[PDB]
């Protein structure tokens, strides 16, 4: 089933070790609520060798399957470690009095493939520039097995 798509930009400044992720938007998200929509927010994790180094999250948008965020996050990653980390992006539904269930997730960086690997490589090909791309969300369990 189609889970939706996430747009984000990546920028990396190797001399400063500064990685900036901008969560731009999502589109066509799986609906998660009785009212036919979702209340989506996005989590970013910086991972290295299966350990969480840093966690960030966006604000929560209400009643929408097509949120616009334009929210920026900064990470410190030394240049000698840049090909060892993963940036994992998860879209979840917020339910204040229930559970927050994941809609789907993707990751870029170490062991990534296809357009995710190309997005990461294009970040490194264009130092300090914010390269944006749309990515298809994948089933949470399946991505978790790739990250393990």
């Amino acid at each position: 089933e189609k889970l939706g798509d996430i747009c984000f930009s990546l920028a990396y400044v190797p001399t400063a070790g500064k990685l900036t992720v901008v969560i731009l938007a999502a589109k066509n998200l799986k609906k998660m609520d009785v009212g036919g929509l979702s209340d989506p927010y996005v989590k970013i994790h910086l991972m290295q060798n299966g350990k969480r180094l840093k966690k960030k999250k966006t604000t929560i948008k209400k009643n929408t399957l097509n949120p616009w965020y334009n929210e920026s996050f900064s990470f410190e990653v030394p240049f000698e470690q840049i090909q060892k980390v993963q940036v994992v992006v998860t879209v979840l539904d917020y339910d204040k009095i229930g559970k927050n269930d994941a809609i789907g997730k993707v990751f870029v960086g170490y062991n990534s493939t296809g357009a995710e690997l190309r997005h990461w490589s294009d970040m490194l090909a264009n130092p300090a520039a914010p390269i944006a791309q749309w990515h298809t969300l994948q089933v949470e369990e399946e991505v978790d097995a790739m990250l393990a």
Side-chain angles (χ1 to χ4, degrees), residues 4 29 50 55 61 81 90 117-118 133 137 142:
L29 296 178
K55 169 188 168 172
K61 302 298 175 170
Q81 309 292 319
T90 304
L117 177 59
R118 177 58 183 268
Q133 175 66 286
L137 298 175
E142 296 180 11

Side-chain angles (χ1 to χ4, degrees), residues 43-50 52-100:
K43 188 152 52 171
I44 307 170
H45 288 103
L46 179 68
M47 312 287 301
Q48 187 169 348
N49 206 24
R52 292 168 294 175
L53 300 184
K54 199 69 181 180
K55 169 188 168 172
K56 297 293 201 307
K57 59 181 169 172
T58 67
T59 68
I60 303 158
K61 302 298 175 170
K62 315 290 186 169
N63 294 317
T64 181
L65 303 177
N66 299 279
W68 175 260
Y69 295 97
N70 190 24
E71 288 177 41
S72 188
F73 305 91
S74 300
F75 302 85
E76 293 208 51
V77 179
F79 186 19
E80 285 194 88
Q81 309 292 319
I82 190 59
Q83 297 304 69
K84 298 178 185 179
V85 300
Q86 296 150 327
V87 173
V88 188
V89 178
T90 304
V91 181
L92 302 94
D93 174 65
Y94 174 77
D95 186 336
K96 181 179 178 62
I97 59 169
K99 299 173 179 298
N100 299 335

Side-chain angles (χ1 to χ4, degrees), residues 122-141:
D122 282 346
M123 173 193 77
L124 292 176
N126 297 273
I131 304 298
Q133 175 66 286
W134 278 103
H135 295 284
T136 300
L137 298 175
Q138 305 292 325
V139 173
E140 174 182 36
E141 293 77 10

Side-chain angles (χ1 to χ4, degrees), residues 1-5 26-33 37-41 64-65 67 69 89-94 100-105 137-141:
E1 67 178 304
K2 301 190 181 312
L3 303 174
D5 303 273
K27 189 144 198 66
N28 298 338
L29 296 178
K30 173 183 175 68
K31 61 116 198 179
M32 298 291 282
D33 186 77
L37 302 168
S38 296
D39 300 308
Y41 65 103
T64 181
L65 303 177
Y69 295 97
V89 178
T90 304
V91 181
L92 302 94
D93 174 65
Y94 174 77
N100 299 335
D101 290 319
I103 289 173
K105 66 196 297 185
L137 298 175
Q138 305 292 325
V139 173
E140 174 182 36
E141 293 77 10

